[PDB]
Amino acid sequence: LEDRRIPGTAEENLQKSSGGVPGQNTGGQEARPNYHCQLCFLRSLGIDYLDASLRKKNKQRLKAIQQGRQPQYLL
């Protein structure tokens, strides 16, 4: 059990939730807002988020990952 396919989304193969209930906060159109406050991640995640804001302990280790614009993305 890891990120990317935690809510049966499979790297957002189509979308997390929209028909019947989207929830902009959980990730409706913007996708990245308070779902898990773009840090908590695990519950939503429009990619392999990791967390490119708090990151726990990643953006700083590699001399490139500290920047990388976003984090692990859908790669």
mmCIF file of C-alpha atoms in Angstrom, residues 8-36:
data_model
loop_
_atom_site.group_PDB
_atom_site.id
_atom_site.type_symbol
_atom_site.label_atom_id
_atom_site.label_comp_id
_atom_site.label_asym_id
_atom_site.label_seq_id
_atom_site.Cartn_x
_atom_site.Cartn_y
_atom_site.Cartn_z
ATOM 1 C CA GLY A 8 -7.984 3.265 -6.512
ATOM 2 C CA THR A 9 -6.979 6.203 -8.856
ATOM 3 C CA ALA A 10 -3.848 4.452 -10.354
ATOM 4 C CA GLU A 11 -1.736 7.640 -10.975
ATOM 5 C CA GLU A 12 -5.066 9.536 -11.709
ATOM 6 C CA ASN A 13 -5.870 7.251 -14.763
ATOM 7 C CA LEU A 14 -9.116 9.289 -15.216
ATOM 8 C CA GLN A 15 -9.773 11.407 -11.994
ATOM 9 C CA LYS A 16 -10.199 10.973 -8.159
ATOM 10 C CA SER A 17 -13.859 12.195 -7.748
ATOM 11 C CA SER A 18 -16.130 14.396 -9.981
ATOM 12 C CA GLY A 19 -19.468 12.774 -11.179
ATOM 13 C CA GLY A 20 -21.815 12.868 -8.128
ATOM 14 C CA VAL A 21 -19.156 14.529 -5.856
ATOM 15 C CA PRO A 22 -15.939 16.346 -6.895
ATOM 16 C CA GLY A 23 -14.872 18.460 -3.856
ATOM 17 C CA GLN A 24 -12.485 21.265 -5.004
ATOM 18 C CA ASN A 25 -10.792 21.025 -1.553
ATOM 19 C CA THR A 26 -10.147 17.229 -2.072
ATOM 20 C CA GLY A 27 -8.950 17.967 -5.692
ATOM 21 C CA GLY A 28 -11.779 18.895 -8.138
ATOM 22 C CA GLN A 29 -10.407 21.264 -10.850
ATOM 23 C CA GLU A 30 -7.208 22.646 -9.178
ATOM 24 C CA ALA A 31 -6.487 19.062 -7.757
ATOM 25 C CA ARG A 32 -3.726 20.402 -5.355
ATOM 26 C CA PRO A 33 -5.322 22.360 -2.322
ATOM 27 C CA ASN A 34 -6.477 21.047 1.199
ATOM 28 C CA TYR A 35 -7.428 17.399 0.411
ATOM 29 C CA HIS A 36 -4.324 16.608 2.668
#
